[PDB]
Amino acid sequence: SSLPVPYKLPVSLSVGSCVIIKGTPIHSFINDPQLQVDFYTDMDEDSDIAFHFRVHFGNHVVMNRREFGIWMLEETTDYVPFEDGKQFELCIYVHYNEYEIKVNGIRIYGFVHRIPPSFVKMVQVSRDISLTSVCVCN
Amino acid sequence: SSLPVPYKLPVSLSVGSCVIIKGTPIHSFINDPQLQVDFYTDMDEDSDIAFHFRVHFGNHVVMNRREFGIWMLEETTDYVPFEDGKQFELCIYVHYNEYEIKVNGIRIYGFVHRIPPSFVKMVQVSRDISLTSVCVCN
């Protein structure tokens, strides 16, 4: 891995920001690897989460948020266009009303903001991936 | 301009970070446009500056730092491979001992750290450019 995992990146996000994560799963899909990305409100892992994204490669994606320490109503989609054994590009674009999630250039979901994205101060990338790069662009 | 100028971007930098700035000068070189990038230690414009970079397009680059509010000994180079009227890519790479400055893929200088780069909390891009994008990568 070019970068350590879990990877905790301090960030400042605004409307128009894009988080770009490039990496490769460390297991084949028959072994049920996962990728997780959390938009944390502080560096502390127990802080609230504006957007939690967990990919079960070859299966489905689960999303949620944690407010006042409480996980809210989970959201899901079966559209997970990641390829077995290959590098992926995951883009999370901050729109005024939602995070748009793109996988390898394919829009898969829009997760609506329940707190403003400018409250996000750390992005954590975790679980079963080798991380090649992480970029924050505007 | 895709982005407002001056553009003040909160950042967290570490060894291995790269700041990538893409834009175009707003004047032809016969009109002496400038581009400035400052690695500020706070959002406040009067805070100390770990690395100040000022391009006089077609002419030269001046670099400095501001410590305890005092500008230190200025550094310069005549190598400014920006092209008149064209978009440029400026990359500032954080190495353990210096910022390496690349213009359109060409290394032009290494500005040695006098304070650690992790003290940089804001990057300001200013002066005579239309700003297409700014990215911070690791």
Numbering used by the authors:
A (entry chain A), B (entry chain A): 2 to 139
Question: What text appears in the publication on this structure?
Answer:
Galectin (Gal) is a lectin that binds to β-galactosides. Because the primary and tertiary structures of Gal-13 are highly conserved among all galectins, it had been named galectin-13. However, our crystallographic and biochemical experiments (solid phase experiment, hemagglutination assay, and biolayer interferometry) proved that wild-type Gal-13 could not bind lactose or a rhamnogalacturonan Ι domain (RG-I-4) from Ginseng Pectin. Primary structure alignment showed that a highly conserved histidine residue was modified to arginine (Arg53) in the ligand binding site of wild-type Gal-13, which may be why Gal-13 could not bind lactose.
We assumed that mutation of Arg53 to histidine would be sufficient to recover the ability of Gal-13 to bind lactose. However, this was not the case, and R53H did not co-crystallize with lactose. In the present study, we used PEG400 as the cryoprotectant for R53H crystal, and not glycerol. Surprisingly, we found a different compound bound in the ligand binding site of R53H. Mass spectroscopy identifies this compound as Tris. However, here, lactose could not co-crystallize with R53H, but Tris could. Tris has three hydroxyl groups and binds in a triangular shape. It seems that Arg55 plays a role in stabilizing Tris in R53H. Here, we found two Gal-13 variants (R53H and R53HR55N) that could co-crystallize with Tris, that also has three hydroxyl groups and shows a triangular shape when bound in the ligand binding site. However, the hydroxyl groups from Tris could not be merged with the oxygen atoms of lactose.
